[PDB]
Amino acid sequence: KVFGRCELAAAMKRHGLDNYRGYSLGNWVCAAKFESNFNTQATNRNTDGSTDYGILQINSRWWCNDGRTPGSRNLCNIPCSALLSSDITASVNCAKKIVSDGNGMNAWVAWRNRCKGTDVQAWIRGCRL
Ligand SMILES: [Cl-]
Numbered sequence: 001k002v003f004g005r006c007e008l009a010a011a012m013k014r015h016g017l018d019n020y021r022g023y024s025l026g027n028w029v030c031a032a033k034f035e036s037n038f039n040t041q042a043t044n045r046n047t048d049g050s051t052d053y054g055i056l057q058i059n060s061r062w063w064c065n066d067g068r069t070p071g072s073r074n075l076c077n078i079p080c081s082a083l084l085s086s087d088i089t090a091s092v093n094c095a096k097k098i099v100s101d102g103n104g105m106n107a108w109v110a111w112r113n114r115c116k117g118t119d120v121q122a123w124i125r126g127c128r129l
């Protein structure tokens, strides 16, 4: 599913991401825009053989099982394919674990390079929330 900007903001808010670990909603929308272009079906393979999955590009080396990342963990206790669903619940629940892991949203490279320090409230402007 490709979400609209305000549609995704509303779904993220309903699932508890606004101000989760101190990160306002616009940070999460900005990260999703640059990680996946709001597309739940996005995948990207990394040089180490791991793959990033879904709207927040969650990586199989640590967070989900895809059966093809040797030596990896599955800390979210999910198949990686669950992160591609039109329902973002599994992605949000796993993102909550990631952002709690010590580095905050710096875990998302696109957030650190394209969202951090910018006017992230622009991403929720005009939305009925
Ligand atoms: Cl947009």
Ligand code: NA
Binding pocket: 021, 022, 103, 104, 105
């Ligand atoms: Na933090």
